[PDB]
């Protein structure tokens, strides 16, 4: 059975997709955009009050396997709009106006092999010609400054860049998606572990977007707020000072696209658990997520 303070397994996940969409209908939809090397199905909930002409934010979970919390975050993040929608004025105000874009797991292969197998594996399961080396590291699959820098050639390494930007069946389903639907696509949120940080462009290099200025005040107050609730302290700024200059990123990619708002979220913790966060920290690390990602959806709304 599926819980909201336990990791769950694909199967689990999948069934919840359904479930929580045929209870709430008239707040949530679900799609499949694509399906990813090993035949399962990239779902993607549309969480928000139907209307016409509405603008979104995207938000995904499980780009690499083993954040599992990554994944927990999107299933908590839906039961709180759905739950809180009518009652909570900024929640209610927020599926009014705009539709969350949830993508729940976009490396499904990797997580369901993180579940069977090895539970530090990363990348997706895609097979590589000329090696029994298996998979590509997704968030150095996308077209910014493609494997120019702080990326792997080689299919073996965990930071594999792929054999071309977007050769991967579920980073060409998010590219594609996100591509089809730019105009009214107004922030996107990417949801990763462990370091307790907010990223924003640009990882691939050195140069600043033009906006870095609101991107620093924006991700500044974010970080703020998630520290009310439990204490927790997330450093932010710019990918490449920040962590380290890697290419290929989604967060650089969709910035580049015209999504002015791009951020890379980095939970809980700073390495006491690393990757292997506890299930007992499920919860609050879900509840001061929350914050930040509701103060930057606020924030957004009043500056369409
Ligand atoms: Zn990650």
Same mark, same amino acid.
């Given at each position: 059975?599926?819980?909201?303070?336990?990791?769950?397994?694909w199967e689990?996940?999948?069934?919840?997709?359904?479930?929580?969409?045929?209870?709430?209908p008239?707040?949530?939809?679900?799609?499949?955009?694509?399906?990813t090397?090993?035949?399962?199905?990239?779902?993607?909930?549309?969480?928000?009050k139907?209307?016409?002409?509405?603008?979104?934010?995207?938000?995904?979970?499980?780009?690499?396997?083993?954040?599992?919390?990554?994944?927990?975050?999107?299933?908590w993040?839906?039961?709180?709009?759905?739950l809180?929608?009518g009652?909570?004025?900024?929640m209610?105000?927020?599926?009014?106006?705009?539709?969350?874009?949830?993508?729940?797991?976009?490396n499904?292969?990797?997580?369901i092999?993180?579940?069977?197998?090895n539970r530090?594996?990363?990348?997706?399961?895609?097979?590589?010609?000329?090696?029994?080396?298996?998979?590509?590291?997704?968030?150095?699959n996308?077209?910014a400054?493609?494997?120019?820098?702080?990326?792997?050639?080689?299919?073996?390494?965990?930071?594999?860049?792929?054999?071309?930007?977007?050769?991967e069946?579920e980073?060409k !389903?998010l590219?594609?998606?996100?591509?089809?639907?730019? $105009?009214?696509?107004? /922030? #996107?949120?990417?949801?990763?572990? &462990? +370091?307790?940080?907010?990223?924003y462009?640009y990882?691939?290099?050195?140069?600043?977007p033009?906006?870095?200025?609101?991107?620093?005040?924006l991700?500044?107050?974010?970080?703020?707020?998630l520290?009310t609730?439990?204490?927790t302290?997330?450093t932010?700024?710019?990918? !490449?000072?920040?962590?380290?200059?890697?290419?290929?990123? $989604?967060?650089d990619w /969709? #910035?580049?696209?015209?999504?002015? &708002? +791009?951020?890379?979220?980095?939970?809980?913790?700073?390495?006491?658990?690393?990757?292997?966060?506890?299930?007992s920290?499920?919860?609050?690390?879900?509840?001061?997520?929350?914050?930040?990602?509701?103060?930057?959806?606020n924030?957004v709304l009043?500056?369409?």
């Amino acid at each position: 059975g599926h819980s909201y303070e336990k990791y769950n397994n694909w199967e689990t996940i999948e069934a919840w997709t359904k479930q929580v969409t045929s209870e709430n209908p008239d707040l949530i939809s679900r799609t499949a955009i694509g399906t990813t090397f090993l035949g399962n199905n990239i779902y993607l909930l549309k969480v928000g009050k139907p209307g016409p002409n509405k603008p979104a934010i995207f938000m995904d979970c499980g780009f690499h396997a083993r954040e599992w919390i990554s994944h927990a975050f999107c299933q908590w993040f839906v039961r709180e709009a759905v739950l809180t929608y009518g009652y909570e004025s900024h929640m209610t105000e927020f599926l009014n106006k705009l539709d969350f874009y949830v993508l729940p797991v976009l490396n499904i292969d990797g997580y369901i092999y993180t579940w069977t197998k090895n539970r530090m594996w990363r990348k997706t399961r895609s097979t590589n010609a000329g090696t029994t080396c298996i998979g590509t590291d997704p968030n150095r699959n996308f077209d910014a400054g493609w494997c120019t820098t702080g990326a792997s050639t080689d299919p073996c390494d965990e930071t594999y860049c792929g054999s071309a930007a977007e050769s991967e069946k579920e980073t060409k !389903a998010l590219a594609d998606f996100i591509r089809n639907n730019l $105009s009214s696509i107004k /922030a #996107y949120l990417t949801i990763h572990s &462990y +370091s307790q940080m907010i990223l924003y462009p640009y990882s691939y290099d050195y140069k600043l977007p033009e906006n870095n200025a609101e991107l620093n005040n924006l991700a500044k107050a974010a970080v703020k707020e998630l520290a009310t609730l439990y204490g927790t302290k997330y450093t932010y700024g710019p990918g !490449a000072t920040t962590i380290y200059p890697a290419a290929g990123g $989604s967060d650089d990619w /969709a #910035y580049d696209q015209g999504i002015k &708002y +791009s951020f890379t979220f980095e939970l809980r913790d700073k390495g006491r658990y690393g990757f292997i966060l506890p299930e007992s920290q499920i919860q609050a690390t879900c509840e001061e997520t929350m914050l930040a990602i509701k103060y930057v959806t606020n924030y957004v709304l009043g500056h369409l």
